[PDB]
Amino acid sequence: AGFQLNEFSSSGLGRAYSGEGAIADDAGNVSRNPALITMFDRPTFSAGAVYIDPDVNISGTSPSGRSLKADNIAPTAWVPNMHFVAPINDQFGWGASITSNYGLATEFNDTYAGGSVGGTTDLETMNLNLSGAYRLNNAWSFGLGFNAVYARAKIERFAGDLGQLVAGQIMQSPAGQTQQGQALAATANGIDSNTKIAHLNGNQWGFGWNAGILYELDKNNRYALTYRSEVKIDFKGNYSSDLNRAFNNYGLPIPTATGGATQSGYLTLNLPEMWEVSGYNRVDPQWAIHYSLAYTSWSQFQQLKATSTSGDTLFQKHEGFKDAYRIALGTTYYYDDNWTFRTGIAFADSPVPAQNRSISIPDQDRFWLSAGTTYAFNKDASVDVGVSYMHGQSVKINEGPYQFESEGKAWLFGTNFNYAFHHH
Numbered sequence: 196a197g198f199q200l201n202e203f204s205s206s207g208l209g210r211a212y213s214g215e216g217a218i219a220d221d222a223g224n225v226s227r228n229p230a231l232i233t234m235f236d237r238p239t240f241s242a243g244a245v246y247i248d249p250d251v252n253i254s255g256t257s258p259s260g261r262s263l264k265a266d267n268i269a270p271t272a273w274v275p276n277m278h279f280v281a282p283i284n285d286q287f288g289w290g291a292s293i294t295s296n297y298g299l300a301t302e303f304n305d306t307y308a309g310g311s312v313g314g315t316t317d318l319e320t321m322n323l324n325l326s327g328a329y330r331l332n333n334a335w336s337f338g339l340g341f342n343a344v345y346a347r348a349k350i351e352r353f354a355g356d357l358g359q360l361v362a363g364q365i366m367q368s369p370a371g372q373t374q375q376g377q378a379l380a381a382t383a384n385g386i387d388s389n390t391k392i393a394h395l396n397g398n399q400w401g402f403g404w405n406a407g408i409l410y411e412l413d414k415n416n417r418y419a420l421t422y423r424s425e426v427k428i429d430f431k432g433n434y435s436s437d438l439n440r441a442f443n444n445y446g447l448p449i450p451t452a453t454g455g456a457t458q459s460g461y462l463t464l465n466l467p468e469m470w471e472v473s474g475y476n477r478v479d480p481q482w483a484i485h486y487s488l489a490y491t492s493w494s495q496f497q498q499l500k501a502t503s504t505s506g507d508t509l510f511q512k513h514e515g516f517k518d519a520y521r522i523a524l525g526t527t528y529y530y531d532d533n534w535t536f537r538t539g540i541a542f543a544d545s546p547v548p549a550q551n552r553s554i555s556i557p558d559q560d561r562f563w564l565s566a567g568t569t570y571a572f573n574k575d576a577s578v579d580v581g582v583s584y585m586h587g588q589s590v591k592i593n594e595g596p597y598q599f600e601s602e603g604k605a606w607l608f609g610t611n612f613n614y615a616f617h618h619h
């Protein structure tokens with residue numbers, strides 16, 4: 196699912212985030228649906244983190260003869276979460292949380308033959324949320340939330356074997372016999388595969404809002420609709436390329452060379468909005484069933500475009516994402532006053548059309564299998580441990596002169612501590 200994260204709590208991880216937004220056994224879920232606030236009787240707190248260990252691989256051969264093989268190109272990630280919820284009165288409450296809905300990390304050796312389209316790609320995101328909720332009656336609740344998103348990003352690309360390729364082209368050509376042609380071949384051969392062809396970095400705050408509706412049949416069965424708005428991050432940061440000025444203005448398909456000098460740069464990143472419907476059903480004093488369909492408007496993310504203080508394009512990449520859905524189903528076994536158990540599955544289709552796949556964000560349809568458990572120390576305190584495994588199909592990728600194959604899987608492990616305070 197592109198660069199979206201769902202890892203906002205360890206219990207959620209055990210459910211495979213199914214019907215999140217209709218469950219309120221810990222404070223974690225208010226981030227997902229502000230209306231769940233009305234479900235809380237006293238100040239409740241939750242803090243933990245999810246460890247994501249991807250194993251994503253690339254295979255292929257460049258036209259140069261060099262291998263396009265790259266193993267383990269998605270570094271492990273630690274995603275923290277922190278949550279708080281508290282009543283105001285019989286019909287009002289509020290919450291705050293620190294989560295992450297968007298994140299991405301890909302890394303190739305700066306010597307990689309295909310380095311002009313896989314160097315380093317890093318996006319980390321933090322969502323500061325502040326919600327309030329109104330209890331209309333025993334059935335209807337409403338939530339309204341505001342989000343301050345802090346985002347830190349970095350892009351780096353290298354000349355892989357392009358220097359070699361270009362030199363070959365010249366030398367095979369009639370210009371191979373010319374002084375002019377030879378000098379260019381020399382220059383091309385001279386571009387090391389670790390020559391930095393593009394650098395971007397910046398951090399910026401962005402802002403958005405979210406809303407949610409909660410409907411309860413009884414104390415054991417509810418349903419929810421939630422909306423999370425788009426958030427536009429307007430980066431202003433640094434752009435650089437180690438290539439000589441002399442490369443620019445011939446219309447070659449490359450980022451603007453700056454001879455290593457840094458230029459101020461502007462790029463707008465769109466974090467897509469998301470809708471979600473959720474259902475929770477406590478079938479039995481020990482058994483619950485939960486499920487959700489979520490819809491993310493990835494079409495809101497069309498490209499990476501970077502711009503000088505003069506309006507010139509310094510670096511551009513077409514993304515052309517399409518809207519995508521995530522669906523999930525899970526169960527919870529409330530064994531005894533101490534132990535709770537859970538498992539779930541989810542599926543998410545890639546928002547990246549095959550013809551726009553790229554190796555920096557090698558995405559495919561995914562499945563999650565998860566299981567988790569909660570131990571309750573004492574009605575006031577509990578720890579949540581969750582495990583999830585994700586599997587993705589292998590997919591074909593075409594960028595520039597290169598053809599790749601990609602496969603990805605991952606293990607997720609997470610722990611959360613929960614505390615509940617003195618009632619009213």
Ligand SMILES: CCCCCCCCOCCOCCOCCOCCO
Pocket residue numbers: 200247271272273274298299300318319320
């Ligand atoms: C699939 C990637 C999504 C997230 C990418 C950025 C998220 C930040 O992860 C960085 C991973 O680095 C590990 C964190 O460092 C260890 C922190 O643990 C210290 C405990 O206090």
Ligand SMILES: CCCCCCCCOCCOCCOCCOCCO
Pocket residue numbers: 311312352353354355357358361383386392448449450451452508509510511512
């Ligand atoms: C300069 C105008 C910007 C238009 C394109 C921006 C996006 C470019 O990214 C394409 C990535 O290709 C990088 C390859 O650069 C060439 C390195 O080797 C050239 C030496 O022969």
